[PDB]
Design a protein around this ligand. Structure first.
Ligand SMILES: [Cu+2]
Ligand SMILES: [Cu+2]
Ligand SMILES: [Cu+2]
Ligand SMILES: [Cu+2]
Ligand SMILES: [O-]
Ligand SMILES: [O]
Length: 466
């Protein structure tokens, strides 16, 4: 019998107007074997923090780990001071408080650690949570909204484990090149769970929370997914797709029809990324089973969802060029180890390594922001991965941007709205980006590749705003 899909608690402010998040180590069970894991308000993963546009929420964060961590609100438009990048250190056994002055549209964002050089490991150990932002607009739509019934978060992650059951994380020459990936897929921390969903429309809030693995969602029987939202919020209208690529750290919300009785699976399809199509990921891989039930639901697929502003005119905009690179020795050694271990299937569908990944010729330097961006002004950022064939989902803190061109082409319709991530893979991308909030040298915004092992080995830059 498949375990039921764990549903993260939807966390709102308490009596005192505060939200409390504890970061700690505990135990989880995978395939009948115990493993040390980390979680927010629990042993693994975390809650969904519920925020409202125009309202302030104070979060008290208690680090009960025996090492330093930070807490970053991925997708949130907040000042550098509360961004929780690598400078936002929470001492082990300590507490830091932040006030989130939420001022962006309804969206599914998320939160996770950003410890300098160790973010890959800290996510792999289990730290990730969700953010549900609501506004006046979205609540007027007749979208499915019964949390954990017909409005369901789906955090999809791979891991690998050693024979003793423990999470087998390493940042080594291979993983610094191609990323940390595993052979076991988790859905809100469970292996191939089932979710009982009302007949009618089911809303899934999908997060690719893998360190390095890209995903491609579809249904087992090829029924369509209706995309209603991306990283930064609602699309102007639903986009019908038969499959949905999702890069590391991206979110999409989809609606899917729930028939009367017969179950079906959400699946992920094999991707063309180095290392990611090794069995059992060489074939469609189940993510979770959806089991129809006959209980109350009234969610609908609306004809129109929202209104996007026009892209800003390109004339006069500051252009910033971000050249991603990997030391040729890392690229070659990394690919060699991958090929030697796994053989040709590692390419199906296609010297210190600790500072071998770079932007504009420089591995991340926490003490030296690369540039000062303007506040309240659209800029055009041009991000290139010409020079290697690794996947680089490029993510910029402090903003939700518009993609102008994604890796050689205009963005697909469902990726043309509000995004915090853009694909860079052997080509060049352009985003139109505005920062509404300040970030000083001491608490700078990060712009980085969200393949975490690249990030941890230097593919990140700091920038100030204001
Ligand atoms: Cu972020
Ligand atoms: Cu992130
Ligand atoms: Cu990268
Ligand atoms: Cu980040
Ligand atoms: O991130
Ligand atoms: O992030």
């Amino acid at each position: 019998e498949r375990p039921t899909l764990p549903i993260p608690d939807l966390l709102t402010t308490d009596a005192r107007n505060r939200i409390q998040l504890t970061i700690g180590a505990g135990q989880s069970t995978f395939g009948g074997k115990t493993a040390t894991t980390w979680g927010y308000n629990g042993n693994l993963l975390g809650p969904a923090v519920k925020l409202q546009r125009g309202k302030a929420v104070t979060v008290d964060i208690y680090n009960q780990l025996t090492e330093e961590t930070t807490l970053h609100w991925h997708g949130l438009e907040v000042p550098g001071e509360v961004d929780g990048g690598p400078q936002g250190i929470i001492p082990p056994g300590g507490k830091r408080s932040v006030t989130l002055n939420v001022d962006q549209p309804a969206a599914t964002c998320w939160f996770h650690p950003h410890q300098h050089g160790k973010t890959g490991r800290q996510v792999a150990m289990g730290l990730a949570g969700l953010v549900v932002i609501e506004d006046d607009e979205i609540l007027k739509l007749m979208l499915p909204k019964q949390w954990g019934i017909d409005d369901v978060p789906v955090i999809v992650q791979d891991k690998k484990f050693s024979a003793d059951g423990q999470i087998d994380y390493q940042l080594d020459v291979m993983t610094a090149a191609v990323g940390w990936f595993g052979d076991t897929l988790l859905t809100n921390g469970a292996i191939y769970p089932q979710h009982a969903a009302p007949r009618g429309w089911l809303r899934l809030r999908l997060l690719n929370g893998c360190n390095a693995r890209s995903l491609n969602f579809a249904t087992s029987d090829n029924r369509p997914l209706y995309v209603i939202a991306s990283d930064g919020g609602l699309l102007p209208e639903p986009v019908k797709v038969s499959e949905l690529p999702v890069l590391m750290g991206e979110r999409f919300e989809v609606l899917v029809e729930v028939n009367d009785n017969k179950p079906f699976d959400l699946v992920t399809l094999p991707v063309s990324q180095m290392g990611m199509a090794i069995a059992p990921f060489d074939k469609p891989h189940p993510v979770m089973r959806i089991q129809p039930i006959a209980i109350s639901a009234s969610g609908a697929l609306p004809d129109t969802l929202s209104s996007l502003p026009a892209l800003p005119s390109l004339e006069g905009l500051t252009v910033r060029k971000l050249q991603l690179s990997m030391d040729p020795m890392l690229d070659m050694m990394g690919m060699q180890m991958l090929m030697e271990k796994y053989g040709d299937q590692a390419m199906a569908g296609m010297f210190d390594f600790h500072h071998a990944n770079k932007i504009n010729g420089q591995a991340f330097d926490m003490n030296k922001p690369m540039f000062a961006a303007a506040k309240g002004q659209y800029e055009r950022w041009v991000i290139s991965g010409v020079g290697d064939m690794m996947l680089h989902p490029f993510h910029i803190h402090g903003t939700q941007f518009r993609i102008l061109s994604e890796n050689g082409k205009p963005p697909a319709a469902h990726r043309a709205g509000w995004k915090d991530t853009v694909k860079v893979e052997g080509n060049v991308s352009e985003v139109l980006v505005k920062f509404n909030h300040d970030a000083p040298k001491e608490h700078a915004y990060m712009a980085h590749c969200h393949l975490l092992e690249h990030e941890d080995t230097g593919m990140m830059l700091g920038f100030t705003v204001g």
